[PDB]
Design an enzyme around this catalytic site. Structure first.
Site, mmCIF file in Angstrom:
data_model
loop_
_atom_site.group_PDB
_atom_site.id
_atom_site.type_symbol
_atom_site.label_atom_id
_atom_site.label_comp_id
_atom_site.label_asym_id
_atom_site.label_seq_id
_atom_site.Cartn_x
_atom_site.Cartn_y
_atom_site.Cartn_z
ATOM 1 N N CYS A 167 22.124 -52.632 -53.569
ATOM 2 C CA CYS A 167 20.960 -53.174 -52.845
ATOM 3 C C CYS A 167 20.152 -52.092 -52.168
ATOM 4 O O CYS A 167 20.668 -51.392 -51.289
ATOM 5 C CB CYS A 167 21.425 -54.161 -51.748
ATOM 6 N N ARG B 32 18.906 -52.538 -47.854
ATOM 7 C CA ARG B 32 19.865 -52.629 -46.758
ATOM 8 C C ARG B 32 19.452 -52.092 -45.367
ATOM 9 O O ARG B 32 20.202 -52.258 -44.413
ATOM 10 C CB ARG B 32 21.187 -51.991 -47.201
ATOM 11 N N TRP C 122 13.357 -60.775 -49.487
ATOM 12 C CA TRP C 122 12.013 -60.788 -50.066
ATOM 13 C C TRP C 122 12.016 -59.799 -51.220
ATOM 14 O O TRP C 122 12.933 -58.952 -51.311
ATOM 15 C CB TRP C 122 10.933 -60.410 -49.073
ATOM 16 N N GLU D 110 10.773 -55.808 -59.329
ATOM 17 C CA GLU D 110 11.677 -56.834 -59.808
ATOM 18 C C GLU D 110 10.909 -57.835 -60.686
ATOM 19 O O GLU D 110 11.387 -58.220 -61.758
ATOM 20 C CB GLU D 110 12.319 -57.571 -58.628
HETATM 21 C C1 HEM Z 1 15.275 -58.067 -47.320
HETATM 22 C C2 HEM Z 1 14.806 -57.760 -48.519
HETATM 23 C C3 HEM Z 1 15.676 -57.301 -49.632
HETATM 24 C C4 HEM Z 1 15.243 -56.489 -50.635
HETATM 25 C C5 HEM Z 1 13.834 -55.934 -50.755
HETATM 26 C C6 HEM Z 1 16.347 -56.280 -51.519
HETATM 27 C C7 HEM Z 1 16.278 -55.527 -52.693
HETATM 28 C C8 HEM Z 1 17.224 -55.646 -53.711
HETATM 29 C C9 HEM Z 1 16.992 -55.333 -55.093
HETATM 30 C C10 HEM Z 1 15.670 -54.849 -55.702
HETATM 31 C C11 HEM Z 1 18.148 -55.551 -55.767
HETATM 32 C C12 HEM Z 1 18.406 -55.350 -57.275
HETATM 33 C C13 HEM Z 1 18.250 -56.692 -58.042
HETATM 34 C C14 HEM Z 1 18.304 -56.522 -59.538
HETATM 35 O O1 HEM Z 1 17.860 -55.479 -60.083
HETATM 36 O O2 HEM Z 1 18.784 -57.441 -60.257
HETATM 37 C C15 HEM Z 1 19.121 -55.976 -54.799
HETATM 38 C C16 HEM Z 1 20.436 -56.227 -55.096
HETATM 39 C C17 HEM Z 1 21.279 -56.827 -54.161
HETATM 40 N N1 HEM Z 1 21.003 -57.112 -52.845
HETATM 41 FE FE1 HEM Z 1 19.311 -56.960 -51.965
HETATM 42 N N2 HEM Z 1 17.440 -56.874 -51.029
HETATM 43 C C18 HEM Z 1 17.102 -57.590 -49.927
HETATM 44 C C19 HEM Z 1 17.922 -58.425 -49.136
HETATM 45 C C20 HEM Z 1 19.257 -58.708 -49.393
HETATM 46 C C21 HEM Z 1 20.046 -59.617 -48.633
HETATM 47 C C22 HEM Z 1 19.565 -60.481 -47.464
HETATM 48 C C23 HEM Z 1 21.308 -59.588 -49.197
HETATM 49 C C24 HEM Z 1 22.528 -60.346 -48.802
HETATM 50 C C25 HEM Z 1 22.634 -60.835 -47.566
HETATM 51 C C26 HEM Z 1 21.279 -58.657 -50.289
HETATM 52 C C27 HEM Z 1 22.336 -58.311 -51.108
HETATM 53 C C28 HEM Z 1 22.123 -57.746 -52.386
HETATM 54 C C29 HEM Z 1 23.198 -57.706 -53.408
HETATM 55 C C30 HEM Z 1 24.622 -58.220 -53.250
HETATM 56 C C31 HEM Z 1 22.679 -57.127 -54.511
HETATM 57 C C32 HEM Z 1 23.364 -56.849 -55.854
HETATM 58 C C33 HEM Z 1 23.019 -58.031 -56.777
HETATM 59 C C34 HEM Z 1 23.638 -57.922 -58.153
HETATM 60 O O3 HEM Z 1 24.555 -57.086 -58.373
HETATM 61 O O4 HEM Z 1 23.205 -58.677 -59.072
HETATM 62 N N3 HEM Z 1 20.043 -58.092 -50.340
HETATM 63 N N4 HEM Z 1 18.572 -55.972 -53.521
HETATM 64 C C1 LIG Z 2 18.363 -61.159 -51.516
HETATM 65 C C2 LIG Z 2 17.637 -60.478 -52.677
HETATM 66 C C3 LIG Z 2 16.416 -59.841 -52.505
HETATM 67 C C4 LIG Z 2 15.811 -59.236 -53.624
HETATM 68 N N1 LIG Z 2 14.631 -58.594 -53.494
HETATM 69 N N2 LIG Z 2 16.398 -59.260 -54.853
HETATM 70 C C5 LIG Z 2 17.594 -59.871 -55.040
HETATM 71 C C6 LIG Z 2 18.262 -59.999 -56.378
HETATM 72 C C7 LIG Z 2 17.500 -60.397 -57.482
HETATM 73 C C8 LIG Z 2 18.139 -60.584 -58.728
HETATM 74 C C9 LIG Z 2 19.526 -60.405 -58.875
HETATM 75 C C10 LIG Z 2 20.206 -60.590 -60.228
HETATM 76 N N3 LIG Z 2 20.838 -59.294 -60.588
HETATM 77 C C11 LIG Z 2 21.224 -59.212 -62.023
HETATM 78 C C12 LIG Z 2 22.528 -59.985 -62.208
HETATM 79 C C13 LIG Z 2 23.253 -59.578 -63.474
HETATM 80 C C14 LIG Z 2 23.008 -60.169 -64.724
HETATM 81 C C15 LIG Z 2 23.713 -59.748 -65.865
HETATM 82 C C16 LIG Z 2 24.673 -58.736 -65.729
HETATM 83 C C17 LIG Z 2 24.918 -58.157 -64.468
HETATM 84 F F1 LIG Z 2 25.818 -57.169 -64.271
HETATM 85 C C18 LIG Z 2 24.204 -58.572 -63.354
HETATM 86 C C19 LIG Z 2 20.271 -60.034 -57.757
HETATM 87 C C20 LIG Z 2 19.652 -59.825 -56.514
HETATM 88 C C21 LIG Z 2 18.205 -60.514 -53.949
#
Ligand code: HEM
Ligand SMILES: Cc1cc(N)nc(-c2ccc(CNCCc3cccc(F)c3)cc2)c1
Ligand code: HEM
Ligand SMILES: Cc1cc(N)nc(-c2ccc(CNCCc3cccc(F)c3)cc2)c1
Ligand SMILES: C[C@H](O)[C@H](O)[C@H]1CNc2nc(N)[nH]c(=O)c2N1
Ligand SMILES: C[C@H](O)[C@H](O)[C@H]1CNc2nc(N)[nH]c(=O)c2N1
Ligand SMILES: [Zn+2]
Lengths: 410, 407
Positions: free
Chosen positions: B106, B109, B278, B283
């Site tokens: 993420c 953070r 947000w 993305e």
């Molecule tokens: C506040 C604005 C936030 C932004 C701009 C942001 C940004 C991102 C982005 C761009 C990703 C990659 C998603 C992808 O490529 O599929 C991500 C992954 C992630 N974020 Fe955030 N994030 C935010 C808030 C949060 C919050 C509130 C949480 C949890 C409380 C969180 C937990 C995660 C986790 C666990 C991942 C990994 C998801 C995965 O492996 O699929 N984030 N974040």
């Molecule tokens: C809270 C939050 C904010 C933000 N800006 N983006 C996200 C976000 C968006 C999409 C995803 C989905 N990530 C891809 C999941 C996936 C799909 C296929 C294989 C993999 F290993 C993982 C996770 C977090 C979540």
């Protein structure tokens, strides 16, 4: 063991068995991944290294277990016993240099690996001799713009006190000059090396694109300065196909990317001077050399001249200028008939290469962090391709900068 | 065993000690790096509970205190008795915030300590889940002024009574395979869409149909519910320079809300924990719009731009990619819906990493995911070495529920 890699765009799954042949360590553990870290011999150890290599060589020519194979192991064993080292046959040297390239997990250009001109410079004894070899490499590889991949291999390490080294990081590179006011003229990447050249007696023109002299060390002796004949140094003035003001930025670059500071390991032998060259991928120049903050740093001036909205990063003015600069680089090289590959073509070819290697070889070690281009990552197919990074020999390795280790004769 | 990370643009070196507290495994070995791979009883529970409460009591400057020892004892008593335990509200909030803090993938953070935690552990039915989720959606959306939130449903018990949201995000668009072999809508969502149809959803069969929620309570069969349309903030996409861009008919939703991950705190497992923040513009503009397996719009955009599409080296794909991403950011900003560009987001992440090294001794980060999918090296994170490792509390992937659910 079998390890699988998946492509998330196409769902193609590949199976890796080649990783079973890796011996050297990655830097990672079960508890930590060091995937983004840039940098993570007595007779005793030498015969096993030689044997492993010669086994691979003989297998590749379909002569494994033959009398020629067995006799060669015997010959090398006796040579090591009595001389502490051994000499490679010309055929083994060529095979070894090709395989170091094939094994280079940070290289996107490996589809080309079997097409490599190998210049054997193991009879070289002096810095003047090195200069001559290097000029010949440059002229051959340049080929008036129709670039040909090549490597020149100087004598191997003996006791580590007689090393051959090219002190330049690339054979052709631009000087950088730190000014009293803290700004830099030319290429900031080369300031330290430029300072050394000047100290050694180089008369610096102090311009923005001054081709550096070669600083060459033969046989452990103090290095010596040579100017590459300017007629051998092909350069390309950078212009843009639509923007006529682009030329007035005064940008140019050289055609031949020629890494001169790596160490080539074959069968346990160490070639500390082994300059090699290919042709550029456009982003190397247009993204990194031109747009890194720590390099020529041209984004601002480009965006200004384009009259982009520069008051907020969210206008994506940097991204816009970056694309235009990279268009200019490819246009300029192509218009001058100097070989270059764009990042789309290069990555698409790498995927085809990687698939072929998995099929014929059982794998293809690749470092995703370096293979993915520094712009437009996910619109290239490598972004979506899972990769496995491991270390095979023969290999190209980093080595310490020679000014840090050299014992000066004075 | 104490490790250095260097920034190659600035020469700043930071020392990592936090990795020594790492618990789970990475996938890598000394022989092979798997950095680019996407998916690499009563006895176990008390050690896990202890490790967590230790870090909790340390965080509130009460380590080794009477209240610390009393809590350890009480949880130990409770696990011995009931083979599970319940977190205090304070511990639950701490744990959720830290799972975000620990999420190495993420980039957002810097925001980790500003998280609204909705405790839904009293929820018993799928209708109750729906109510909690609408409330989360409305709170987080806040008329475009987005606020990060998580809603935490009851923890796993014996594993046959799991709460699950079947959707991968609370708000996503349907995908439909066409008679002619093409795909209408979001190809990522075809299988889930079919499950919705199979469960009874009447699909409009459009390009941007907000999917219904499929909610599973207490291990029961999941149920369909439609999110009140008035709670789903969407943004039509236009370009500040190209008047034809609006004719593409593109839109996206404002609220990114991941609903298929598992939250682990102190050994307890929360299989339904939808969370939201947000968007970062890439993305939507790079991945959702331009992945070949997603809406894949590059060709149509390039054509509307009159670019020379005959040769890769014209960089027509790159040119069109930038213009799509400009439009995404402009459209959200024009409608006052919070969004962050990749320059701003990554600059913030570097500041956050610096804070974390200074105040915590490290920050686990997955470079492969942190670097944006366009313009990598013009963002500061490209030049930043990162160490990837797994700390708990954590968000983890879990199997899709349809492969696991006994009907
Ligand atoms: C506040 C604005 C936030 C932004 C701009 C942001 C940004 C991102 C982005 C761009 C990703 C990659 C998603 C992808 O490529 O599929 C991500 C992954 C992630 N974020 Fe955030 N994030 C935010 C808030 C949060 C919050 C509130 C949480 C949890 C409380 C969180 C937990 C995660 C986790 C666990 C991942 C990994 C998801 C995965 O492996 O699929 N984030 N974040
Ligand atoms: C809270 C939050 C904010 C933000 N800006 N983006 C996200 C976000 C968006 C999409 C995803 C989905 N990530 C891809 C999941 C996936 C799909 C296929 C294989 C993999 F290993 C993982 C996770 C977090 C979540
Ligand atoms: C034929 C055209 C070639 C292209 C387009 C190409 C492309 C590249 C690129 C873009 C890099 C990354 C450079 C960086 O970011 O610093 C690279 C790395 C490398 N390539 Fe190539 N390559 C080519 C030929 C060769 C040849 C002939 C060799 C050796 C015989 C070679 C061995 C390497 C090695 C060892 C690296 C790693 C360099 C490092 O770690 O600094 N490649 N290649
Ligand atoms: C043969 C060839 C073709 C081509 N297109 N590019 C190259 C090439 C260019 C530059 C470089 C330099 N790479 C950066 C070296 C470095 C610098 C600092 C820290 C590190 F870990 C490594 C290496 C290979 C080499
Ligand atoms: C810190 C990080 O590993 C470093 O900036 C890397 C990233 N990827 C790269 N990829 C290539 N091809 N060349 C590089 O110099 C780098 N630098
Ligand atoms: C194979 C590779 O790991 C994969 O395509 C990754 C690369 N980096 C990513 N980065 C983010 N933020 N999101 C992703 O889905 C991916 N996909
Ligand atoms: Zn690793």
């Amino acid at each position: 063991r079998f390890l699988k890699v998946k492509n998330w765009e196409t769902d193609v799954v590949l199976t890796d068995t080649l990783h079973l042949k890796s011996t050297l360590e990655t830097g990672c553990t079960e508890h930590i991944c060091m995937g983004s870290i840039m940098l993570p011999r007595t007779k005793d150890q030498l015969f096993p290294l030689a044997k492993e290599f010669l086994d691979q060589y003989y297998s590749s020519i379909k002569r494994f277990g033959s009398k020629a194979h067995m006799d060669r192991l015997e010959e090398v064993n006796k040579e090591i016993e009595s001389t502490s080292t051994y000499q490679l046959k010309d055929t083994e040297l060529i095979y070894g240099a090709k395989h170091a390239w094939r094994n280079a997990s940070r290289c996107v250009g490996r589809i080309q690996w079997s097409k490599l001109q190998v210049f054997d410079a193991r009879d070289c004894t002096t810095a003047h001799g090195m200069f001559n070899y290097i000029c010949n490499h440059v002229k051959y590889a340049t080929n008036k713009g129709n670039l040909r991949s090549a490597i020149t291999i100087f004598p191997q390490r003996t006791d580590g006190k007689h090393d051959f080294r090219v002190w330049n990081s690339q054979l052709i590179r631009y000087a950088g000059y730190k000014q009293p006011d803290g700004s830099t003229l030319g290429d900031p990447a080369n300031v330290q090396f430029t300072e050394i050249c000047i100290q050694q007696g180089w008369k610096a023109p102090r311009g923005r694109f001054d081709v550096l002299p070669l600083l060459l060390q033969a046989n452990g002796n103090d290095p010596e300065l040579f100017q590459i004949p300017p007629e051998l140094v092909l350069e390309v003035p950078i212009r843009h196909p639509k923007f006529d003001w682009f030329k007035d930025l005064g940008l140019k670059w050289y055609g031949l990317p020629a890494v001169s500071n790596m160490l080539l390991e074959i069968g346990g032998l160490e070639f500390s001077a082994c300059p090699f060259s290919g042709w550029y991928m456009g982003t190397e120049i247009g993204v990194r050399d031109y747009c890194d903050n720590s390099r020529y740093n041209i984004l601002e001036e480009v965006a200004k001249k384009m009259d982009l909205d520069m008051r907020k990063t969210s206008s994506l003015w940097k991204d816009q200028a970056l694309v235009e600069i990279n268009i200019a680089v490819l246009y300029s090289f192509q218009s001058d008939k100097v070989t270059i590959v764009d990042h789309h073509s290069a990555t698409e070819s790498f995927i085809k290469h990687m698939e072929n290697e998995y099929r014929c070889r059982g794998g293809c070690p690749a470092d995703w962090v370096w293979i993915v281009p520094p712009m437009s990552g996910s619109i290239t197919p490598v972004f979506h391709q899972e990769m496995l990074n491991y270390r095979l020999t023969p290999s190209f390795e980093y080595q310490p900068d020679p000014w840090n280790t050299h014992v000066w004769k004075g």
